[PDB]
Every structure is written in C-alpha cells, then in structure tokens.
Design a protein around this ligand. Sequence first.
Ligand SMILES: [Mg+2]
Ligand SMILES: [Mg+2]
Ligand SMILES: [Mg+2]
Ligand SMILES: [Mg+2]
Ligand SMILES: [Mg+2]
Ligand SMILES: [Mg+2]
Ligand SMILES: [Mg+2]
Ligand SMILES: [Mg+2]
Ligand SMILES: [Mg+2]
Ligand SMILES: [Mg+2]
Ligand SMILES: [Mg+2]
Ligand SMILES: [Mg+2]
Ligand SMILES: [Mg+2]
Ligand SMILES: [Mg+2]
Ligand SMILES: [Mg+2]
Ligand SMILES: [Mg+2]
Ligand SMILES: [Mg+2]
Ligand SMILES: [Mg+2]
Ligand SMILES: [Mg+2]
Ligand SMILES: [Mg+2]
Ligand SMILES: [Mg+2]
Ligand SMILES: [Mg+2]
Ligand SMILES: [Mg+2]
Ligand SMILES: [Mg+2]
Ligand SMILES: [Mg+2]
Ligand SMILES: [Mg+2]
Lengths: 203, 147, 102, 52, 210
Amino acid sequence: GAYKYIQELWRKKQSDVMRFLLRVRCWQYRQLSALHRAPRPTRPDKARRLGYKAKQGYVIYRIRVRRGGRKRPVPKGATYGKPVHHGVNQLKFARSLQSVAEERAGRHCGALRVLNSYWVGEDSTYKFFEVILIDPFHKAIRRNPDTQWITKPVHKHREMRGLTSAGRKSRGLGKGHKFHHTIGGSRRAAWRRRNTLQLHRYR
Amino acid sequence: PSRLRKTRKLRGHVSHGHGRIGKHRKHPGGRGNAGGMHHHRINFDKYHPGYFGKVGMRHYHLKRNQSFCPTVNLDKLWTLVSEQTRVNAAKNKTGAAPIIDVVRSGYYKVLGKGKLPKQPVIVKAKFFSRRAEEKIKGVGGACVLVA
Amino acid sequence: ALRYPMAVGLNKGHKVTKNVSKPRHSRRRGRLTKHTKFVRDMIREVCGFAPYERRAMELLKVSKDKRALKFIKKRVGTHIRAKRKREELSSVLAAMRKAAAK
Amino acid sequence: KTWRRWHRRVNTTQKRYAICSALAASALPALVMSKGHRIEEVPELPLVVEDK
Amino acid sequence: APSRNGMILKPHFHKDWQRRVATWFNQPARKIRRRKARQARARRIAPRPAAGPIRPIVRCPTVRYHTKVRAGRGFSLEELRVAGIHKKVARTIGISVDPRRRNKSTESLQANVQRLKEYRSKLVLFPRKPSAPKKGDSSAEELKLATQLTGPVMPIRNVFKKEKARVITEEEKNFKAFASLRMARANARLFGIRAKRAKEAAEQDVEKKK
RNA sequence: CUAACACGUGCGCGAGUCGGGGGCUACGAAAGCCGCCGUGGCGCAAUGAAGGUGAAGGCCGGCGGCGCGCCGCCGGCCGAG
RNA sequence: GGCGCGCCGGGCCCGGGUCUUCCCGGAGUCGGGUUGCUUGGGAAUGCAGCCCAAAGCGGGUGGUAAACUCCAUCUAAGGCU
RNA sequence: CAGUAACGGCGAGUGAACAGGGAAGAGCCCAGCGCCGAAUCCCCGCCCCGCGGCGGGGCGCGGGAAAUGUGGCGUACGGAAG
Ligand SMILES: [Mg+2]
Ligand SMILES: [Mg+2]
Ligand SMILES: [Mg+2]
Ligand SMILES: [Mg+2]
Ligand SMILES: [Mg+2]
Ligand SMILES: [Mg+2]
Ligand SMILES: [Mg+2]
Ligand SMILES: [Mg+2]
Ligand SMILES: [Mg+2]
Ligand SMILES: [Mg+2]
Ligand SMILES: [Mg+2]
Ligand SMILES: [Mg+2]
Ligand SMILES: [Mg+2]
Ligand SMILES: [Mg+2]
Ligand SMILES: [Mg+2]
Ligand SMILES: [Mg+2]
Ligand SMILES: [Mg+2]
Ligand SMILES: [Mg+2]
Ligand SMILES: [Mg+2]
Ligand SMILES: [Mg+2]
Ligand SMILES: [Mg+2]
Ligand SMILES: [Mg+2]
Ligand SMILES: [Mg+2]
Ligand SMILES: [Mg+2]
Ligand SMILES: [Mg+2]
Ligand SMILES: [Mg+2]
C-alpha cells in the first residue's frame, strides 16, 4: 500500500526531497493567514493514523502558532515578590504549541469537536499544525456507531480540558514509576488525595 | 470532660495559670522545632544527641519486602507446633523426631536464645544462626534449609 | 552431600519446573519484515541521505573512524545508536566500493 | 467544628463484660428494686415465660 | 520552645488543612448503600454466582509474601487452551480471563487447569432458550436444584502438607547449615571475579607458553 | 477543638493485643457478629554506614600434640551466674 | 416504566480443531544537549521552549553518571469504556 | 506500607510508591499489512406504515461524497487465506 511508502517518505525529513517540500509548504503557509480551512489534509496517512476518515463531516484546519517560549506578562520588570519569582523571559509554558494550536481552532469553531492534530511545517518564528475536527451533528457520523462517541455531550471541547493526544502529554499522565504524582485522575487529584486528613469517626 | 479539666478551677485567678510577670505570649521561642543550633542547642544536646548531620549511604528505591526476614528464638520454637507433637515425641521410643516448618508459622529465620528441651527435631527454616543450628545439633536434630 | 534449596546462593530460589511456552506476539515488534525492508531501501534510494549522515560518510572514507563515532554520537544521541549508524554507513560504503569496483 | 471526636470505640471483651454484668445483676432482687421496677408480686425474677 | 524531654516531632499541619478534611459521617450510609447495591445485583443476576466470576490460584510476588496464595485477576489463556475452554466462551459462562498473565511454571498451571475442570464439572448451564435444550447443556431435573452461592466461588484455602515425624538419618546430621549458607553467600558474591581471574590466568599462561 | 508525643492514673485481655477498613443480619447513622476477614499496627531482638551477623556454660572416659599438666572430636552427667 | 408472551416485517446466513503458506504496526516522534518550572525523585521524576534529531533480533523500562556483556519486562509517539 | 525510602541554608520543614487486605470489577476499536467489481455514506422527489426522541420499507438512466480510500473481515490475547 502507498501509506507505508509515504510514511517512510515523511520520516526522511532531512532529505532533499522532503526538505524542498517542507520549505515550499512553509512559504505558502506563512504567506496565508493565521487560521484558515484546508480542504483536505497535507498528510493523508498521518490523518488516518490519528483518526481522520475521508467522509462528510471531518474538517481540517491548518493554523500557525507563533513560535517561542513564554515571557511573563508583567509590567516592565517588576514581578513583585521574592527573588525566586523574579524570572521573566526564560520561562517556558506548561503545554505545547501543538496543544495551543488545537485549542485556538477549537475555540474558533465552537460547534465542532477537535479530534486530533499533527505537524506540517515550521520556520524560525512559526509552527504550523493541521488540527482535524468533527462536526458532531452530521448524520454521517451520528449514524455511525464507532464515531458517535464524540457526539455525546461529555466530549465538549476536548482541546481545553486537555484530552487530545497533544493536550494529554502535558498532564504528566501515564502508568509507571515515573508518574507517581498523577495517580488518581490528575496531578491535582493526586495532590488532593494526598493533602487531606481522613478523620474517621472512631480514630 | 471540661467539667474535670483545669480551667474550671482557674476562674477568678486573673492570670489563668500563666503568670503576671511573664505573660502568656504567643510564640516566645519560635514556632515548632525552631532554633536547633542557636538558642535551644542546650536542649537538643542534653536530650536528643545525634539530631543534626548526615551519616550513612543513601539507598533510593528501598523496598521493605526484599529484606523481610522475621526471627524466632529456640525457647519459643516449640510454641509453633501444638502440644500433642512434643508430647508424642517425648513418648515415642522409636526416635522419630517431629518436623517443624517455621516458615508455615511465619518466621523465616531461627535464632538461638533459650534452652531447648532435650528431644530431637527436624527444624526446617530459611536461614539459621550459628548458635541456633549448633543448639539443634546439641539436642541432636537436623537443620533443613528451604527456599 | 545435601543440596537443599536455599534462599541465597548462586542457584538460589525454589525449584520449580520451568515450562517452555511459545513467545507472546508482542515480543516480535520491530523484527524486520521483507516487505518493510523493500519499502525502506526504496525510500532511501528515492530520498538519499541526511547531511550529517553524508558528512559522516565523508569521515569514514578517509578512515578516521573515532571522530566519526564522536560526530554521529553528538548528532543522534546515545552511543548505541551511534555505533548502529556507524555500521550501517560502513555497510553503505562497502556497497558503494563494490559497486564502483564492479 | 464538625470534626470533634464524637465517637468512642470500646474493646470487644469489655463490651462483653458489660452485658454479662448487666444480665447477672438482672437476676438479683435487690438490684432490680433499687433500679426502680416495682416487682414485689413477681413469682421469680429471673423470669422465664412459655415459648408460645 | 521544647520542654525537658520528649520526641521532637514533625506535624504536617503547616498547610491549610481545615479546608481539606474528610469527615466520615457517611460511613454507615455507605455501608447501607453498598449492601443495597449488592442485594440488587444479586437479585438481578438471578441464578448466577453472587460474588461474580471465578478467579484463579495465584502466588504473590515479592519475597515477604510468596508463601501465600491469592485470588488473581483472571484465568490465563494458556491455562484455558489446555483446559479446553475457549477464550470468548469463558467470560460468557463465568470464567474471568486476563491475557496479560504469563505462566512461568507448571505446578501453578496444572492447579489452575484442575480448578477450571473442577468448576466446569460444577456449573449448571441453563439453556439459552428455555423450551428447547441443546448439547452443551445440563439436564432438566438439575435446573430446579440451582441456587446462588454466597461468597467467592470455590474459596481459595491456603493448605499445608503435614510431614510425618521422620527418623533422622546420619546423613542429615552432618549438614552444617550455617557454614553452608555462608559458603553460598561468599560464592554468589565472588563468582564473577573468580571467573575474571581465571580468564586472565588463562591468557597469561598462553603468554608464558607462546 | 483536631492531630502527634510524653508521663501518671482507672478498666479489659495478656506474649500477645486491637477491627478502627470491609462484610453478615422509631429508637437504630446504634448494637451484635466475623477468625481461612489478624491483612495490618504496636509488641515479642538487638546492632552495623553497609554487605551482614544476631543474645550462658561446666564436668568425666577414649582417641621446658609434646619438653590443645593444658582437649582437636565424640559417648555420658549437671545443668542458665 | 420495567421485567413476561404471541404475531407481522426487516437484517444476518454466521462456528471450532489440525496442517500448509503468507502478513504484521502509529516520526520533528522517541531519544540526546541545553534552559526554566515542578517533583520525595537524589550526575536531572514529570512538563515545556530551542537545537540536534533516529532505529527495526528495534525502542523504552530495570530509582548513581558511563563502556562491555548476558537476563527480565512491556510495545510508545491513535481512539472508546 | 509511613511520617518510611527520599528531599531540604540536611536547618525549619517537606515527603510518595511497590507488596498485602478490601470496595468494585468489563473489556474493547481503528490506521497500517492485505482481500473483496465503493461491496460504503449523506440529501432530496413520490408511495405505504408509524410519526410530542423524524424513523422502517419500496421506487427514482435523480443529485452529491468517496480511489488524495467509505464499508465487511481484521489489531499484538496474534491475524488472514487454502
Ligand atoms: Mg523564597
Ligand atoms: Mg477518556
Ligand atoms: Mg513527550
Ligand atoms: Mg492566687
Ligand atoms: Mg501554668
Ligand atoms: Mg498584668
Ligand atoms: Mg514566659
Ligand atoms: Mg521579664
Ligand atoms: Mg502557649
Ligand atoms: Mg548564633
Ligand atoms: Mg515552660
Ligand atoms: Mg513532657
Ligand atoms: Mg500508664
Ligand atoms: Mg509504624
Ligand atoms: Mg511556575
Ligand atoms: Mg506551573
Ligand atoms: Mg519546588
Ligand atoms: Mg544502576
Ligand atoms: Mg497504542
Ligand atoms: Mg493508548
Ligand atoms: Mg546549616
Ligand atoms: Mg511542597
Ligand atoms: Mg498495592
Ligand atoms: Mg468483594
Ligand atoms: Mg472495524
Ligand atoms: Mg481499508
């Protein structure tokens, strides 16, 4: 099948063929606006890996997030307090640019539901991402029993609770000995279970 | 019961059992265990020696189940098995020694403290002291290992 | 002598007859398939090589293997991936030498 | 606060001691009248009635 | 300000703990709610075992507990395929399966296979349609004598084999157990460097001969 | 007032002890019961940084070992200052 | 409303064992360097920015950095419950 | 487990997990590799039924989606075909 060939093709990003393609697509996507609808994926294999099926109701946006860290949004210097919290410009944000790219399109289309997202191009000052979305009130998915799970009202705005593949990876979430501080639902549920007194009746 | 407590006798007494010269102020010596090396050094060295400083090797992912090896002494060795076995061992003219599995009772290691009564045994354990196994040899009896 | 099973020692542990089960099917993930090899070498002849990989080939041609190892280790990370990339580049230079000699 | 220690736990053996003492004192005639039950016409106060 | 003598101690009440406190005054409310839910489930699965499916003999890991035997997650599918029970039909007829468990041994596998066969001898499978019976099915007069059992199905006992009082052989009274333990400790501790020094002595003898 | 600790007192049991978590059967959200629910806590063992080790002995007979009259190893006896 | 039965109509014509031959995996992602935050996680537990950026008897984990060397263990970079 | 391993001007303070006992208990689905004449889906028009959770069937040389891949089998417990 062609998808194994184009998967191994997109794996060789340092090659001259894919380097030419990445810089041409990056030129075009940098010229074009910030959040516009792509008509069809640039990565048809990767979209199928992440969940996209070419049927009526799945909508692909490519959006650019402005690349870089996160300096502290504070007047001039003047973060008032102890010299621990005097950091301004070398601070880094807890979530990733791909998750920010998911939630910007998920907020721009509040009717639709962000399924997942992937990488298309980058330069020194932008990252581009194709976030793929699902129209949850279309009858080509509300009559399909293996994708009507997203039409349920529980999964409203997965991108902003951080339930996607790139929104998940900043929660410290997983099995192991590496992820002791998130057992329970989250690193807040872990903290909340640990910092309570179970004052019983009898004691 | 507040009916029995001290504050019922300290009504009318204008300092409530804390003094007029030195009033009951809030935290006169610092909160908690404060001032270990500075102004309570006399207390922490007359009553808690060794409290300050590091000693010994740091062992990071310690698991208290790897080092599980509970001990039993020989004077309570016969308390593992019911009385009928040792009575029949005292009555047996064959020389059939009773078999005692200490791991079944829940002690991995046998140490030898007390006097052990003079009738044979087959003591099977997971570890042995030097003195314990030779007390078992001195009563005349075998030390079977088990993993 | 007596050889009781002991909790400590060279052959420590309780004696249990180990059965021979066929391995689980998750364990073969990454064992190279003929079709996958035929895809990957074709993709390499379509694309070519990375710039650091061709510069490491340029180091291996002039037989300075040690700084080529250090270069590949600095570019890819671990020393195991460094030696694996070294032996694959040595194989592609061995193929290029025999192809230019034949 | 609500987390005042409202409850008390008692050992099982002296919970049993207590009801044994209550039952055993419910058989003495002086210890029932001093509790207050007007009893003086009862046939016998460890009083067993028919199973019917 | 510590007094004369006592433990110097670390109470973890420096945080704001009164906001996050769990009072347990709904303890008997949950101990009524759980048994109401349990009675409702035991009425809902009407002849089926009230505890649930059957769960296998397992050994604990981790040296402290390996003498004991627990109930496990589910019967391993290696332990199913040699008992003759299909991996999908087991969970239908009431046999818990997990595919994650290996089988390092043979004694445990034979015990779980014997346990599955002893279970399969005891289940009373009702017909899937009550009028017409089928082949994989129990007899009609056994259907009236079915009832829910309480507690775990075939409860796991931790049974010990008692040895009889042997006569001590002279071969057993020469077993120096402490010195044997200590010699085993030293051999297991030193086994690598013995072989390394044997290796270097071998190639230095090659150096002296060649 | 809650929690931890220390000591003194009263109560039950006692080398054990405790169901506090779970379960089974108006007052009662109580009370009873479990024991192949003692898992577990504390205690019954200490010491060492650690590998670790881990809490009386005595007597008899035989075999300058001789220029252990002192036992290496066994059979018997007394036995825990 | 639920568990109960009968009828019409519609979907589906469905399984197991043995042998032979084939086939099998998620990439600017893992990982590495550095910086900042966080963690009990200590020669770096997790998260993120930038730079380098893979492999397929491969990759991760095996709580002290690293090289050789066997073992054990799961199968990431997709999704529901 | 445990106020433990550990962290901390190793000062004050901070501080989990594995194991065991319980409550509950349930597992699964794609992309890929493939094979089946796109075998798949949406909408409008007419007829029959029901229609206050717009659905079931029949007819459309009626319109689109989709080969830049929909459906059926199939997913690491292996799987497909003969
Ligand atoms: Mg500060
Ligand atoms: Mg979820
Ligand atoms: Mg990551
Ligand atoms: Mg006065
Ligand atoms: Mg006073
Ligand atoms: Mg005054
Ligand atoms: Mg004062
Ligand atoms: Mg004064
Ligand atoms: Mg005060
Ligand atoms: Mg000073
Ligand atoms: Mg004072
Ligand atoms: Mg005091
Ligand atoms: Mg006292
Ligand atoms: Mg403790
Ligand atoms: Mg911060
Ligand atoms: Mg933060
Ligand atoms: Mg911090
Ligand atoms: Mg190590
Ligand atoms: Mg996966
Ligand atoms: Mg997953
Ligand atoms: Mg200091
Ligand atoms: Mg903190
Ligand atoms: Mg656990
Ligand atoms: Mg249960
Ligand atoms: Mg499917
Ligand atoms: Mg397909």
